[PDB]
Design a protein around this ligand. Structure first.
Ligand SMILES: CC(C)[C@@H](NC(=O)[C@H](CS)NC(=O)CCC[C@H](N)C(=O)O)C(=O)O
Ligand SMILES: [Fe+3]
Length: 328
């Protein structure tokens, strides 16, 4: 197995007002998006030390009673409104991974998409504050911290594609974004149940099979345990870990709108018997957000692809990913 070229890109100019410096970042984003599809965003300004600590505290202290109380509909039939947000239970002996997903904190009973019962919109569920002191505050502030980073990254992608810097970010708004955070725990287990391990066609032992991300882009923090592989024409290649940077990749919505100029990289999660964290932020737009496709390889830049409403794209993609790679 070879190693993927995953460049470290100093993204800090994307927060600034040096427009030529932004273009140099954009070129690096362009080059990485045309190569393996992944890059590490460094000099990002987010305190990832606190993120990994608050996450470990929550995963290690939440009780089986609380997990049922917060469980999504897939694990608790009483919670029919929890399709996306809530706790995703492990199944000892069968499924090792467990996780907690939350959405836009502005999704409240006051929000018109909640009032309208629009799919993919939900009010977050939270554990008891006294049992998990500071957790909800930490989680909500992290959502907006990574929202700010993601907004800047979207400026880099827009410039990289020859557009004005707000081409994507104008659709990425705190009042309506369908973006989600998932706090994933991959446990150490002795013995590790083979029923929780999948075998790839090439024989690799996996925790999660190949897929493209359902997102515009995905902004991922992981603890320092190598596990990810990206597919290339020459086969799967290891993505090296980096527990200070954010692993950035395009989702299938970006592949659609760029006429596959920026592919959504196919990737998978190797089985590793080690305690670790995987904290993705899925950069999703608004339910009615529509981006007109274009082709940066055509002289006229014209694409025949249909503009896709993001909400319908998200609803179809999340169900499809569950059908193909299992309920997480
Ligand atoms: C590849 C990693 C990001 C991670 N996998 C994942 O997060 C996988 C594949 S991208 N993602 C999903 O299943 C979709 C979660 C969507 C979320 N519940 C929501 O409603 O928005 C892993 O470490 O397993
Ligand atoms: Fe993924």
């Amino acid at each position: 197995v070879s190693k993927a070229n995953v460049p470290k890109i100093d993204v800090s100019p994307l927060f600034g007002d040096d427009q030529a410096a932004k273009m140099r970042v954009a070129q690096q984003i362009d080059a990485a998006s045309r190569d393996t599809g992944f890059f590490y965003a460094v000099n990002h300004g987010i305190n990832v030390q606190r993120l990994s600590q608050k996450t470990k505290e929550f995963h290690m202290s939440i009780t089986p009673e609380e997990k049922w109380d917060l469980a999504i509909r897939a694990y608790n039939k009483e919670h029919q409104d929890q399709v996306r947000a809530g706790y995703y239970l492990s199944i000892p002996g069968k499924k090792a991974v467990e996780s907690f997903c939350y959405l836009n904190p502005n999704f409240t009973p006051d929000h018109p998409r909640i009032q309208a019962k629009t799919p993919t919109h939900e009010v977050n569920v939270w554990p008891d504050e006294t049992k998990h002191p500071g957790f909800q505050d930490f989680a909500e502030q992290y959502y907006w911290d990574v929202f700010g980073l993601s907004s800047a990254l979207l400026k880099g992608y827009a410039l990289a594609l020859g557009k004005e810097e707000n081409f994507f970010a104008r659709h990425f708004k705190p009042d309506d974004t369908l973006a989600s955070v998932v706090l994933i725990r991959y446990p150490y287990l002795d013995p590790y149940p083979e029923a929780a391990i999948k075998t790839a066609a090439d024989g690799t032992k996996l925790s999660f099979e190949w897929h493209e991300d359902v997102s515009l882009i995905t902004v991922l923090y992981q603890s320092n345990v190598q596990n990810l592989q990206v597919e290339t024409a020459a086969g799967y290649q290891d993505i090296e870990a980096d527990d200070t940077g954010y692993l950035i990749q395009c989702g299938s919505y970006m592949a659609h709108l760029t006429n596959n100029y920026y592919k959504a990289p196919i990737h998978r999660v190797k089985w590793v018997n080690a305690e670790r964290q995987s904290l993705p932020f899925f950069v999703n737009l608004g339910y009615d957000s529509v981006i007109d496709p274009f082709d940066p390889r055509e002289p006229n830049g014209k694409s025949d692809r249909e503009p896709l409403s993001y909400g319908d794209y998200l609803q179809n993609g999340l169900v499809s990913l569950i059908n193909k790679n299992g309920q997480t």
